[PDB]
Amino acid sequence: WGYDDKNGPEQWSKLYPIANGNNQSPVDIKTSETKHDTSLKPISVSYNPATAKEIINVGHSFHVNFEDNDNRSVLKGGPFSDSYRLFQFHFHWGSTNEHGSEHTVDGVKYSAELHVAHWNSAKYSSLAEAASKADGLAVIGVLMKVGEANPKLQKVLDALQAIKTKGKRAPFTNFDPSTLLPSSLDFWTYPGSLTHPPLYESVTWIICKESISVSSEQLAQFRSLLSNVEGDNAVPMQHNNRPTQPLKGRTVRASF
Numbered sequence: 001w002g003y004d005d006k007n008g009p010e011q012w013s014k015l016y017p018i019a020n021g022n023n024q025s026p027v028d029i030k031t032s033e034t035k036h037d038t039s040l041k042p043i044s045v046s047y048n049p050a051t052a053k054e055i056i057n058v059g060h061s062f063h064v065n066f067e068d069n070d071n072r073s074v075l076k077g078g079p080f081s082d083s084y085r086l087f088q089f090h091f092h093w094g095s096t097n098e099h100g101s102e103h104t105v106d107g108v109k110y111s112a113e114l115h116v117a118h119w120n121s122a123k124y125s126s127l128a129e130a131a132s133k134a135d136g137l138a139v140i141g142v143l144m145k146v147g148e149a150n151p152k153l154q155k156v157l158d159a160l161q162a163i164k165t166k167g168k169r170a171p172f173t174n175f176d177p178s179t180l181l182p183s184s185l186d187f188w189t190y191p192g193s194l195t196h197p198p199l200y201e202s203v204t205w206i207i208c209k210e211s212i213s214v215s216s217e218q219l220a221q222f223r224s225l226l227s228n229v230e231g232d233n234a235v236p237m238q239h240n241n242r243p244t245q246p247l248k249g250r251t252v253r254a255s256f
């Protein structure tokens with residue numbers, strides 16, 4: 001699978017029939033149809049910068065992985081009773097500034113989206129176990145609006161020159177990804193999925209109402225990551241965003 005024509009979002013259901021399921025992500029959040037849920041607690045994140053581990057070029061994207069053996073780095077509050085353990089963050093982006101985000105709000109596409117992913121360590125013993133469970137994953141989604149250069153993206157963008165091609169990886173340490181989150185943690189939530197294969201309907205989404213900035217040049221740095229292995233013809237990682245999917249009767253709840 002990929003984001004090509006022959007292997008991309010439109011083809012994904014041929015090998016992953018859950019692509020056409022009832023809890024697929026991302027979605028369009030229509031704000032006139034969201035329901036204020038007054039029992040939603042505020043989102044609490046507390047991450048320890050010492051859990052940052054490694055950055056990796058995964059061919060379709062890049063991941064920043066965190067040590068997840070303990071509860072040094074956790075998400076709590078919002079719709080959860082369970083504590084969730086940070087394991088990774090990554091971005092999605094598009095061909096052009098005009099699209100790029102995965103989630104859309106009242107039909108508006110943003111230019112990129114940051115996903116900060118966590119697994120349910122109160123109920124499960126590992127990511128591998130958690131990943132396929134309905135209440136297994138918690139992902140903060142932050143919409144990225146093209147404008148001012150974001151200095152907080154800094155260390156991440158500077159690390160990419162070490163992981164230019166597919167499979168390359170390098171240490172990436174002493175980083176607290178709560179520094180990338182918007183100042184307000186007001187959010188939408190709904191039950192959904194991973195936005196790429198294997199597309200498990202295991203994710204409770206926490207979508208921030210407030211966007212963060214990214215410059216047009218910052219976005220070019222993403223798209224200049226290569227999806228080929230070192231030595232092969234250069235293939236820019238131009239886009240990795242999936243089209244929005246049918247709510248199929250789910251409700252988007254709002255914290256605000």
Ligand SMILES: [Zn+2]
Binds near residue numbers: 091092
């Ligand atoms: Zn993602």
